[PDB]
C-alpha cells in the first residue's frame, strides 16, 4: 500500500515531465511494444474459440486483465524511475468542461492534443506526435503515427459523466452469466460500456478516436494507460463499496474467465489481482 | 537432469497412449489453445518493428524461444500425469525409410496419418482427426480440422537427412550478425532451415504440410511439439559439441534477441534456458 497513483490534475509540472520521459524510454528500449502486442493478442484470443468473448474484453476477465496489465506497465516504469507511478485520467470531471479538449491532460508537455484534420488527424503536438513516436498496425508493422479525433463519432460525441460512473457503482453483481456483452445488472459489463453501448470505458475509447478507437491498436496511445488507470480506480472503489461481493464467475465460466484461471497471455489469475493494495499501490 | 525425453520409437504402447491422452486433456481444459496463441503472437511480433525478424523465428531467439515453449508445455503435461514427458521425432532417421509416411509416429494410435485428398486433405485417422480435435485459424476462430499433406510441395518433397543434421552440428558459431534469415555460418540459421531453404526445421514444417506448413497455425498439429523436441535435442547436442561456444548475440542485438532480453510473449530470457538440464530434463 505504498505506490500512490494520482489524478493527472494533481501532478507536478515535474511529475508529468518524468512520466512522459519514462514512457519514451520504455518505448526506445522496445518494452512498450510488448504491451501493444500483449493487448492485441488477448483481444484475438476468444474464450472459447468462435465465441464473442476474448481474454481481455467482452467478458469477466476484462477488469482483472487490465489491472494486471497496468501493474506490469507500472513496474517497468518503476524500473526506469522509481518515483514514477501510473496517474489516472478522471474523464468524468473533464466531461463537465465546456470543451473537454482543453483539459490539461492534452497539453503539449503531456499527452499532446487532438489530431490534425489537414493532416488526416495525425497528432502533431506533444511528446507523441508523429515524428517523435512510432506506431504499429494490427499486423505488427510500423503504421506512421498516432491519430486522435475527439468526439467525432455519432455514437460517442461526449465523454462519460459522473452520473454514469455513480450509477455503475450501484450495481450489486460483479458480473452475471452468460458473462459476455449481453450480461445484465453486471458491474463489469456496465463499467466496460456495453449496457446501451457505447458507455463509460468503451465510450472513452470511441471518444478519443484514432488508434484508441479500436482494440488491436489502442495501446499505441499512451492515454490508454491513463484511461485504464481510472477504470481500475473505479473498480477499486466498487470493491470497497460492495466489500462482500466478489469476482464472478468462480467456476464453470469459460476457461480463462474463472476466478482461478490463468489470463492469456499470462499465467496470472483474477484472484491474483483482486486486492490492489496487495499489488503495492493505492489511488 | 531427471525428466527423460525419449525417441518416439523407444516409447512403449502405454507411454504413447498416455502422451496422447494427456494432450487431449490439455486441449479439453483449454490450455492447449494458449500455446497455439502464444506461438502465433510471437510470430507477428517483429524485432524490431517493420523488420523480418520475430520473437520466435528468423533470428537468434528461435532456439531459446522454442525451448522455453516446450518446457512450459511439458510442465503442463506433467501437471496432468507426472510420468509423461515430451518425446522427440527423429525425422533424420525416418528420412531413410522407403516411405516415411509409414513411420510408427503416424500410427492411428499416436499422431494419425496423412491427410485425405478426398476430404481436401483433412486428417481422418488417429486421435486428432477432424471430429475429435478442434483447430483454429490465424484469426483465432475455429477452423474445422487438422490437415496434412506429406511432401506435397516441390520445395520440400523429402525430410531432412542425418547428413544435413551432422553438417549443421559442425558449425562453430551459434549465430552471426545481422542475426536474421541471411546469417551465414550460423548454427541457428542453419538448424532453423534458411541456408538454401527450406532445410532442416523449416523443411519438416513444409514436408508435413497442412497447419504445420505455416507459422500462424503450426501448433494446431501435436507433431509440432515432437518436431521441436528433436530440434531442441539437436541444439542440446551442438551445445555439448561446442562446450566453449555460447549464445549470440549477448548485447547490441535487437531487443528480445539479446542474451538477457525477455522473449515475448514472456519475460524469460535465452540465458534462463541455456542449460536444458537446469530446466529439469535430458534426452
Ligand atoms: O459499446 C461499444 C463500444 C465500442 C468501443 O470500441 O464500440 C462500439 C460499441 O457498441
Ligand atoms: O527457408 C524456408 C523456410 C520455410 C519455413 O517456414 O519455408 C520456406 C523457406 O524457403
Ligand atoms: Cu482494449
Ligand atoms: Cu480499454
Ligand atoms: Cu517450428
Ligand atoms: Cu513456428
Ligand atoms: Zn491526489
Ligand atoms: Zn477476433
Ligand atoms: Zn468519479
Ligand atoms: Zn452491493
Ligand atoms: Zn483501495
Ligand atoms: Zn531412447
Ligand atoms: Zn505394441
Ligand atoms: Zn501404437
Ligand atoms: Zn541424428
Ligand atoms: Zn552421407
Ligand atoms: Zn544434454
Ligand atoms: Zn567448437
Ligand atoms: Zn518459464
SS (HEC) of chain B:
CCEECCEHHHCCHHHHHHHHHHHHHHHHHCHHHHHHHHHHHHHHCECCCCCCCECCCCCCCHHHHHHHHHHHHHHHHHHHCCCCCCCECCHHHHCCCCCHHHCHHHCCCCCCCCCEHHHCCECCCCCCCCCCCCCECCCCCECCCCECCCCCCCCCCCCCCHHHHHHHHCCCECCCCCCCCCCCCEHHHHHHCCCCCCCHHHHHHHHHCHHHHCCCCHHHCCHHHHHHHHHHHHHHHHHHHCCCCCCCCCCCCCCCCCCCCCCCCCCCCCHHHCCHHHHCEEC
Report the alpha-carbon distance of residue A173 to residue A190 in Å, rounded. 10
- Of A223, A196, A228, the residue nearest A212 (C-alpha): A223
Report the alpha-carbon distance of residue A203 to residue A95 in Å, rounded. 12
Are A50 and B141 contacting, i.e. CB atoms less than 8 angstroms apart?
yes
Cα nearest neighbour of A41 on chain B? B41
Are B234 and B170 contacting, i.e. CB atoms less than 8 angstroms apart?
no
Neighbours of B255 (CB within 10 A): 16
- Residues in chain B with CB shorter than 8 Å from the CB of A50 are 141-142
Q: Looking only at Cα atoms, what is the longest distance across chain B?
A: 53
Ligand 2, CB within 6 Å, residue ranges: B 193-194, 197-198, 202, 205-206
Q: Looking only at Cα atoms, what is the longest distance across chain A?
A: 53
**Which of A149, A189, A195, A197 maximizes ligand 1 atoms within 8 Å of its Cβ, making it the mutation to test the pocket?**
A197
- Residues in chain B with CB shorter than 8 Å from the CB of A44 are 37, 139-140
Pick from B30, B48, B139: CB nearest A44:
B139
* Host domain of residue B26: 1-283
- Cβ–Cβ of A45/B140 closer than 8 Å? yes
**How far is CA A109 from each of CA A71, A126, A199, A209, rounded to the nearest angstrom?**
24, 6, 29, 21
| Experimental determination technique | X-ray
Pick from B33, B38, B49: CB nearest A33:
B49
Q: How far is the CA of B146 from the centre of ligand 13 (A)?
A: 26
Neighbours of A170 (CB within 10 A): 11
Q: How far is the CA of A239 from the centre of ligand 11 (A)?
A: 8
Show the cell assigned to B93.
532417421
How many structural domains does chain A have? 1
- Of B159, B154, B178, B135, the residue nearest B230 (C-alpha): B159
Answer whether A80 touches B (CB < 8 Å). Answer: no
Q: How far does A270 lie from chain B, in Å, by closest CA?
A: 17
- Of A77, A85, A70, the residue nearest A39 (C-alpha): A70
- Of B264, B43, B270, B258, the residue nearest A38 (C-alpha): B264
Element (H, E) at A253: none
**How far is CA B26 from each of CA A136, B19, B60, B75, rounded to the nearest angstrom?**
34, 11, 30, 11
Report the alpha-carbon distance of residue A168 to residue A162 in Å, rounded. 10
Reduced 3-state DSSP string for B126-143:
CCCCCCCCCCECCCCCEC
Report the alpha-carbon distance of residue B222 to residue B251 in Å, rounded. 35
Show the cell assigned to A18.
518524468
Neighbours of B268 (CB within 10 A): 17
In this structure, is the dihedral angle defined by the CA atoms of residues A45, A47, A49 and A50, taken in order, positive or negative? negative
CA atoms within 13 A on the CB side of B59: 25
What's CA B216's distance to the chain center, in Å?
13
3-state secondary structure of A159: coil
Element (H, E) at A188: helix A187-192
Are A277 and A75 contacting, i.e. CB atoms less than 8 angstroms apart?
no
* Cis amide leading into A210 (omega within 30): no
Residue A210 backbone class (left: φ over 0; alpha: ψ -120 to 50; beta: rest): left
Show the cell assigned to A21.
520521459
Residue A197 Cβ < 6 Å to ligand 1: yes
Taking the CA of residue B202 as reference, the ligand 2 atom at the shortest distance is 5
Looking at chain A, how many residues does it have? 283
- Of A100, A98, A97, the residue nearest A111 (C-alpha): A100
Q: Is A57 annotated as a binding residue?
A: yes
- For residue A71, the domain's CATH number is 1.10.1280.10
Are B51 and B254 contacting, i.e. CB atoms less than 8 angstroms apart?
yes
- Cβ–Cβ of A49/B41 closer than 8 Å? no
Helix orientation angle between B31-44 and A31-44, rounded to the nearest 10 degrees? 130
What's CA A58's distance to the chain center, in Å?
14
Residue A201 Cβ < 6 Å to ligand 1: no
In this structure, is the dihedral angle defined by the CA atoms of residues B173, B174, B180 and B185, taken in order, positive or negative? positive
Amino acid at each position: 500500500k505504498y505506490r500512490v497513483r494520482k489524478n493527472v490534475l494533481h501532478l507536478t509540472d515535474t511529475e508529468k515531465r518524468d512520466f512522459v520521459r519514462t514512457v519514451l524510454i520504455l518505448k526506445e528500449k522496445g518494452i512498450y511494444d510488448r504491451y501493444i502486442a500483449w493487448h492485441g493478442a488477448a483481444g484475438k484470443f476468444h474464450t472459447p474459440p468462435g465465441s464473442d468473448r476474448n481474454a481481455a474484453h467482452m467478458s469477466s476477465a476484462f477488469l482483472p486483465w487490465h489491472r494486471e496489465y497496468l501493474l506490469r506497465f507500472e513496474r517497468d516504469l518503476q524500473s526506469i524511475n522509481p518515483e514514477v507511478t501510473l496517474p489516472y485520467w478522471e474523464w468524468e470531471t473533464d466531461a463537465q468542461m465546456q470543451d473537454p479538449s482543453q483539459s490539461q491532460i492534452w497539453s503539449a508537455d503531456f499527452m499532446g492534443g487532438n489530431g490534425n484534420p489537414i493532416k488526416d488527424f495525425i497528432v502533431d503536438t506533444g511528446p507523441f506526435a508523429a515524428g517523435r513516436w512510432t506506431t504499429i498496425d494490427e499486423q505488427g508493422n510500423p503504421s506512421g503515427g498516432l491519430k486522435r479525433n475527439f468526439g467525432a463519432t455519432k455514437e460517442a460525441p461526449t465523454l462519460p459523466t459522473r452520473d454514469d460512473v455513480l450509477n455503475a457503482l450501484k450495481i450489486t453483481q460483479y458480473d452475471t452469466p452468460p458473462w459476455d456483452m449481453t450480461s445484465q445488472n453486471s458491474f463489469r459489463n456496465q463499467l466496460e460500456g456495453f449496457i446501451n453501448g457505447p458507455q463509460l470505458h468503451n465510450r472513452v475509447h470511441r471518444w478519443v478516436g484514432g488508434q484508441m478507437g479500436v482494440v488491436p491498436t489502442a495501446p499505441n496511445d499512451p492515454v490508454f494507460f491513463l484511461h485504464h488507470a481510472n477504470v481500475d480506480r473505479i473498480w477499486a472503489v466498487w470493491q470497497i463499496i460492495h466489500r462482500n461481493q466478489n469476482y464472478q464467475p468462480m467456476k464453470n465460466g469459460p476457461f480463462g474467465q474463472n476466478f482461478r484461471d490463468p489470463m492469456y497471455p499470462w499465467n496470472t489469475t483474477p484472484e491474483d489481482v483482486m486486492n490492489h493494495r496487495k499489488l503495492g499501490y493505492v489511488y
